[PDB]
Every structure is written in structure tokens, then in C-alpha cells.
Design a protein around this ligand. Sequence first.
Ligand SMILES: *[B]([O])([O])[C]([N]C(=O)[C]C1=[C][C]=[C]S1)C1=[C]C(C([O])=O)=[C][C]=[C]1
Length: 358
Amino acid sequence: APQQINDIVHRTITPLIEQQKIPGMAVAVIYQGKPYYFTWGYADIAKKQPVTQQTLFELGSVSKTFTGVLGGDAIARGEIKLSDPTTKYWPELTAKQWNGITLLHLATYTAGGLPLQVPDEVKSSSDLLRFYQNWQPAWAPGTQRLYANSSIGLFGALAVKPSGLSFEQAMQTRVFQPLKLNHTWINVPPAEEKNYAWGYREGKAVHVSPGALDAEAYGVKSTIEDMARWVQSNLKPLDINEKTLQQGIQLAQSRYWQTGDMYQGLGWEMLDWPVNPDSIINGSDNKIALAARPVKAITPPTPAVRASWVHKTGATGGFGSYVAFIPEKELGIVMLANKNYPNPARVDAAWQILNALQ
Ligand SMILES: *[B]([O])([O])[C]([N]C(=O)[C]C1=[C][C]=[C]S1)C1=[C]C(C([O])=O)=[C][C]=[C]1
């Protein structure tokens, strides 16, 4: 790889791993459209397995970017509309608070305070129905943003209903396969287990546990190579041959709501480029990222802006991931690690690297 990329990447990531005590990590930098890979440490400490370009990491919430794009693809296919009422898909949601809550609200965390996490006791489809029927909104629809798995997770489940496919099958057929993400999974097959890194929480090896709407909200696992391809696809959706997918990616980067200097897309989050590093760095901290904030509707939504810093943080109990890219510069980065370390450190490192290369 060009020495400039090698140097900034190593000079930034090496101290990060030491400071955060990250067991293993993989990084891909997309520069002028080409990917460059880097790896460090262990995927499995006990078994001495190193992290390689084929190592699978839990993406955690970066999965929401796939859900957003799959949802966009469904819109493009004319299967659903963001303006559709939630009840059009789940007529069983008869509780009055659902009146006026649309797929857009679910996808963008603006339904009125749907909770960050789906309760552990909620497992089955009837459990899920009961949970949403009982939920009491804190605010009217479209007034406040509260990042939530229960919100975009429900969006994902409903978005794939007309297709007649399960969420996994729709994702495989409509997103993974067309983009050649042949080592990206919602469920890791036994044959691939040898490449599945262990996550580390308080020193113990862990993998994500089954949960309601896990697939839709935080259940994708992937390699640094497939994630680099994911960044390339979102950087240049026009290079994609499948029409509805190309459109779907575009729709997920449209700006639907604004809060502070951040715009909410479908899964992805965006800021105008150039960005103020302190804004995205401090903004990534959960103290802000998970906070309830009033939002301004962007009427109508702004189509994907090429001069944007598009990104998403993701975590599971044992993993910490981050993806960020700037369409206008054909520049991007993916950072996958098997430790859930502070978001601010992830974004600061990504900024140092991309700022140096821009
Ligand atoms: B997402 O924002 O990364 C989301 N992830 C998950 O819910 C998956 C997890 C399963 C067990 C622990 S996280 C999320 C992340 C966090 C966080 O900052 O750790 C909190 C709530 C949701």
C-alpha cells in the first residue's frame, strides 16, 4: 500500500490498541476507490488465532446500515413507502398510540420514544406484538429522536413483509449476494466458525446472544474485506447494477431529520463535510448519541449529499465497530475490533486517518 496510508494508519491504530487494550483489530482504508487492509492481534486469545482479512467480527449496530439499505431497496421496488402507516403491515397494532406512526418514524427513531432495547423477556412474535401494543409514547410522532433498536428493528421486520421473504433471506438475496458480500452473515455457518473472532468483555470471550429483532438491529457479522466492499458500494452507488439496490443505497443516505449538526438517514447518519472533528467525536459518545433530542423535519428529505461525512458506530457486548466515508473524496474507513471500546476514540482515530488522506 502507499507509504502515506501505511504510516497514518499504523501511527494512529497502534497507540489506540495499546491505550484501549483491544485484543484484535482489522482496518480497511478506501482511498481513491481502492481498499487497503491492516490487521493486528488476536481473534481468539486462548487459541492464539490471529486476526486476518477473513476474520468475522460482530458489526453490532453497523448492521442498521444494512437494514436501512434493505428497506430503501424495498421502497425502490415499490413494495413499501416510508409514508405508510405502521398498521398497514401490522394491522394488529390496534392501540391508539400507533395512529400516525409511519415507517419513516420507525426507521429514523422518531416514533415518540420507542425504547433503546427490546426487553429480554420479549421473544416470540406474540410477545413482540404485546410489547408494542403496551408501549406508551413520551412524545408525538416526528418531534423527538431517541436512538433505539426497537424502532429501526421493527422497521426492518415490516419492510420485508411484502417480499414474502424472511428478513435474513431478503438481506442475503437483495443486498449481500448482489454486492458480493460472500462472507457476511446474520447467522454464522458452521463452516465459517473457524474465522469467527471471539468478542472480549471484562476479559471473557463472548459472542452476541439471540434476541428479538437481533438480525434487524445488530446481528450482522462480517470480514474487513466485505466491509470495505460495503463502503465502496455506499461511496459509489451508481456503479451498482441492480437498479433498486442502487436507489436503496441512495435513499438510505437521504437527510430526513436534523438535530444539531447531524442528519438522520436510514441507518446511516450524516454531517456536512468538512465536519468539525470535535462535533463528530464528542457526538459519538453515548451521552449524546443515546440522548432524546428534538428534531427538525427536512421537508422534503435532501437526496444523498456527496459532500458528507457518512458514518455509523456499532457495538455488541464484546465488539466495537465504526465505518465512515466521504463520497465526494472516494475516501472511507472501516475499523473492526473485538472489544467494545469508547466511541469517541473510534471516531478520533478515523478522523486522524481520513483527515490526513483528504
Ligand atoms: B448499537 O448502537 O451498537 C446497539 N447494539 C446492540 O444493541 C447490540 C448489543 C448486545 C449486547 C450489548 S450491545 C447498542 C449499543 C450500545 C452500546 O453503546 O454498547 C447500547 C445500546 C444499543
